[PDB]
Amino acid sequence: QKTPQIQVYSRHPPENGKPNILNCYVTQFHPPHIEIQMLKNGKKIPKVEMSDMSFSKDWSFYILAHTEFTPTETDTYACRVKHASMAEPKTVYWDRDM
Amino acid sequence: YTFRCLQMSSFANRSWSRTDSVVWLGDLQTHRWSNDSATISFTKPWSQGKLSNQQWEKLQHMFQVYRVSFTRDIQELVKMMSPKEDYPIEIQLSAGCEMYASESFLHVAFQGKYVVRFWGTSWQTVPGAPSWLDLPIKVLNADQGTSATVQMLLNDTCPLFVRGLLEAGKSDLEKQEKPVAWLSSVPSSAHGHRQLVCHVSGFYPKPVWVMWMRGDQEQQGTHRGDFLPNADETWYLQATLDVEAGEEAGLACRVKHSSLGGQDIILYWGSLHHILDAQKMVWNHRHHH
Amino acid sequence: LLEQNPRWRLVPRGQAVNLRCILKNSQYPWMSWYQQDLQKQLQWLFTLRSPGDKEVKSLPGADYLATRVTDTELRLQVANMSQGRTLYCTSSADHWTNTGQLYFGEGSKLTVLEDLKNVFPPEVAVFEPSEAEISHTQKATLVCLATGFYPDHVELSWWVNGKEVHSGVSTDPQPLKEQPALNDSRYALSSRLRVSATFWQNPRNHFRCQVQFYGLSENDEWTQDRAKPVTQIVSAEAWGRAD
Amino acid sequence: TQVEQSPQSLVVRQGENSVLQCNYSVTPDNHLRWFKQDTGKGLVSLTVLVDQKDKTSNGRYSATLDKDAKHSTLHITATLLDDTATYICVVGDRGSALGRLHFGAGTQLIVIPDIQNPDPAVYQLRDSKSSDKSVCLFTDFDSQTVYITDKTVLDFKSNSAVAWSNKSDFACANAFNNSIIPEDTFFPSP
Ligand SMILES: CCCCCCCCCCCCCCCCCCCCCCCCCC(=O)N[C@@H](CO[C@H]1O[C@H](CO)[C@H](O)[C@H](O)[C@H]1O)[C@H](O)[C@H](O)CCCCCCCCCCCCCC
Ligand SMILES: *[C@@H]1O[C@H](CO)[C@@H](O[C@@H]2O[C@H](CO)[C@@H](O)[C@H](O)[C@H]2NC(C)=O)[C@H](O)[C@H]1NC(C)=O
Ligand SMILES: *[C@@H]1O[C@H](CO)[C@@H](O)[C@H](O)[C@H]1NC(C)=O
Ligand SMILES: *[C@@H]1O[C@H](CO)[C@@H](O)[C@H](O)[C@H]1NC(C)=O
């Protein structure tokens, strides 16, 4: 078993109001079975497109999930990941400052 | 350029199994082979390389037999391991060639740990492999037919098909996309310290140079981040600098890339541009790290 | 070589059977089971390599359980037989083609019966050559007739002057049903010994037709008026005539 | 079924040529085997075929294989009476012990003897023990031609049938009354 690394980031400079694309990039996990959702305020975002799963030179898997979004001063985006190496589902919030 | 075909095989129990594949030329995905699909999908227009339809069809049928035979073969060999049938089981396969003269390879991992490889004419166990692998390896090695076509694949077919992909993929392997950079800030884990963050996004090809600067002097505390992908096969990177408060003044993030001529991107902290960029990012800060 | 046991067995419909495959040389370790139904269609069952490997499989119409106990012994428990099967045991090394070979055993013929009282031993009769045949062809043919037996497993041989002969013999390939429309019918089988007229006409010449029959064991419960039909030999004999 | 043999049954005169067909759809086809099973006995390997366009000679046997057409043939030159057997075409799933065999239904080969100058006759034979059971012997019919035995083949080779019955007035002359009988058959009075 290897626990997932979750990184959340925007495609373009994250100006409020303007349309942008949010990326949730999961890494360093084994086995390859994994559930990923992207969350807006708590509710699941209906169309989250995903890349195919691949692995790296250390034989650990990585996948990229992404969706279009419009950032707001008040609206919060997150990425939840269920994996066997974890008791509870890990939820990671987008921090534009990070 | 390093061509690699990757294979992910999951064996959950006696009945359940799937196997999916992806093919990379450098940092560009060229093929996708889902368990669900009978055929091998193209992700690019040039994914057929220089092969002709008849030559491609033959190879796809070659692989179609392989996928079905592999799944049966593994589920019989799994009966020889210690302890007997240790479900679940993951098998990973990495086969390709590097370009220069060339160098083909085929490596195999079991439960995430690399244990077997093809070498010369046969299958061999790598140093530190489980001793139970000796028996399965002998049976696989007894199969001249497999042995001979794998040889053909690695020695002859990988280099040839790649050399074709490279020629017909040149246009896409040469394209240049400009980085866009923007600045942000976070409190540091140490008291009175703050972490300056320089976001570089949307660049291709992958090689890039990013540093914090006091004009002349590169700031040695610059921590380059990991290369994170974008959905459109571009790249995202960030570089951080830990400063004491009232030391941000006079600092700049510099970015060198092949797509910028010689004209580096320089962003100064507190510069008129930065101020207006920052005013557009504001938010309530929850739930912050 | 590859010893298969037992060679033959009667199975009262609704009981199990134990089959063994002791292998004489450990250099050919890839033991596997093959089935051949009453319609002569062959099929692969199980293929076992490691000691301790046990596997189950259900087929029309017999359920199997095969284990590889030791590196030399291979078992197969056969249960719930509906209809007759014959089971073959094969071993090879890792290679099995260019550097061969693949080896086959003698097999185990299993026959399924409903009732035990349905087992009858054969009546045997030798019919003397025709005096017309002798005139016309200068050869003399004896016919042997084994009738009224069940099941169909009989082995027939000719014995001229106390020793077995193959020269001049042709026996039926398979037995035939006496009452063809009925399921629990009894069988009959014929053979011919064709000799020269001179050789038959010798009064000192003795002709015997023996028929081995495979039926019940000493380990089968039986209390009925007629005799307990054990695995036995039944014969008939004739001496020659001069005229 | 994945291995189709044809025909199901075949008849040849002793000394003539005989050809058996096998078309398969097993994938992958690594090798092909021919087997001979004498009735009531085990299997005997006749030949193994390995390559894309193969051929092998086993004394009186010879076989070809085309993997392109997933097809094989077996030839027996100058057939003997002991060639009466079932012939089984089988395909090798792998080139190692990981593979499984797939078996065709078998083609049943029946060899009928070359009887130049036949001598058809029906004789009645009596029980050695007395009495009064009897049997009929039909001897030496050429192989174009109540419990009747199927025709068997002797080795001077002869086709011969045997008929017996327990019915009031049998009798041998009209025993093979459901049969094609030579117009010159000898029917001696009993
Ligand atoms: C290969 C790279 C060259 C570049 C060209 C390809 C570019 C196009 C992109 C393709 C994308 C598709 C993703 C491909 C996945 C990457 C792996 C590719 C390498 C696969 C090996 C090719 C094997 C081909 C031979 C084969 O199908 N063998 C078959 C059939 O063989 C049978 O049929 C044949 C007829 O076709 C012959 O007659 C043979 O004698 C008979 O036995 C045979 O069954 C093989 O044994 C299959 C297994 C092979 C996997 C080896 C695994 C070793 C690891 C075991 C250790 C784990 C421990 C176990 C618990
Ligand atoms: C594929 O290339 C390998 C080398 O990478 C060849 O393996 C050699 O085989 C020869 C003769 O079989 C041996 O003398 C060498 O020792 C082998 N080399 C190694 C490094 O093991 C192989 O023969 C080639 N196959 C084909 C079809 O050309
Ligand atoms: C095999 O695995 C799948 C998924 O892990 C599961 O749905 C199925 O119940 C399993 N079958 C078994 C344990 O027989
Ligand atoms: C994957 O595909 C194979 C056919 O190649 C199928 O038999 C198997 O059940 C599939 N597994 C899943 C999980 O879809």
Side-chain angles (χ1 to χ4, degrees), chain B residues 1-53 55-56 58-83 85-97 99-143 145-162 164-166 168-169 171-173 175-262 264-289:
Chain B
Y1 290 108
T2 329
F3 181 75
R4 59 166 177 157
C5 306
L6 306 175
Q7 190 201 302
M8 298 127 50
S9 292
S10 301
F11 293 88
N13 46 57
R14 303 271 279 167
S15 76
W16 201 94
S17 51
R18 73 174 301 112
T19 161
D20 308 73
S21 298
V22 277
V23 176
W24 296 89
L25 181 82
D27 47 17
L28 297 188
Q29 192 194 323
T30 60
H31 307 86
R32 174 223 257 92
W33 195 17
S34 174
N35 192 86
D36 305 289
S37 179
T39 46
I40 301 168
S41 302
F42 294 156
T43 38
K44 263 79 204 170
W46 49 273
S47 292
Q48 199 169 315
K50 282 288 168 196
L51 303 179
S52 60
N53 291 354
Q55 300 170 218
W56 175 253
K58 287 222 319 144
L59 197 74
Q60 191 179 227
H61 180 278
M62 204 278 309
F63 281 118
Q64 272 155 24
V65 162
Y66 163 72
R67 199 174 72 172
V68 185
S69 308
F70 173 79
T71 310
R72 193 179 93 174
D73 278 4
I74 288 296
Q75 275 181 306
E76 320 300 313
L77 300 162
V78 160
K79 293 174 195 180
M80 308 206 214
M81 78 176 57
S82 56
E85 302 189 299
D86 202 43
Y87 294 106
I89 283 153
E90 299 293 344
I91 310 273
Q92 281 166 277
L93 272 144
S94 179
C97 45
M99 294 301 112
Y100 306 98
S102 62
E103 183 92 317
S104 290
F105 61 91
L106 198 165
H107 301 273
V108 193
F110 185 88
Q111 302 322 298
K113 196 154 69 47
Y114 153 62
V115 287
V116 169
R117 99 241 217 246
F118 196 93
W119 193 248
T121 50
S122 73
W123 297 108
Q124 283 189 317
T125 52
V126 190
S131 80
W132 63 258
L133 276 165
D134 286 355
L135 223 57
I137 285 299
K138 214 198 166 194
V139 209
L140 265 47
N141 281 341
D143 182 355
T146 295
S147 172
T149 54
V150 172
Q151 285 182 54
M152 166 198 277
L153 285 175
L154 299 175
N155 294 4
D156 294 337
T157 327
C158 192
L160 207 47
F161 170 65
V162 182
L165 274 186
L166 289 165
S171 176
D172 290 337
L173 292 165
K175 62 170 163 66
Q176 299 268 337
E177 297 300 327
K178 288 160 171 172
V180 183
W182 72 92
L183 306 191
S184 82
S185 191
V186 286
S188 143
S189 54
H191 186 265
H193 288 65
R194 272 223 144 219
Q195 186 174 311
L196 278 34
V197 177
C198 180
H199 312 245
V200 189
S201 188
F203 64 102
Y204 178 87
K206 208 167 175 199
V208 77
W209 186 95
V210 188
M211 278 288 196
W212 282 95
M213 311 272 280
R214 294 211 117 84
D216 234 12
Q217 310 299 341
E218 316 179 51
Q219 303 295 97
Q220 295 292 78
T222 304
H223 179 260
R224 224 152 148 281
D226 256 354
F227 284 82
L228 321 172
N230 278 320
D232 54 297
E233 259 155 344
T234 42
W235 295 107
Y236 173 98
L237 189 95
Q238 60 181 39
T240 73
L241 191 70
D242 196 284
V243 298
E244 268 145 49
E247 181 173 82
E248 316 93 310
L251 287 169
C253 179
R254 200 202 283 253
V255 173
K256 287 181 167 67
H257 196 271
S258 46
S259 73
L260 300 170
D264 302 334
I265 291 162
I266 311 177
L267 289 175
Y268 297 85
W269 204 87
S271 64
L272 186 62
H273 180 285
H274 171 81
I275 309 276
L276 286 167
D277 260 44
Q279 189 56 50
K280 296 181 286 183
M281 293 206 325
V282 285
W283 63 299
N284 52 20
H285 294 118
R286 50 192 294 281
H287 318 84
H288 62 302
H289 305 302

Side-chain angles (χ1 to χ4, degrees), chain D residues 124-128 130-131 134-140:
Chain D
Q124 195 193 55
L125 290 75
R126 319 206 76 86
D127 186 11
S128 178
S130 53
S131 50
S134 74
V135 144
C136 315
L137 187 53
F138 191 26
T139 58
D140 282 298

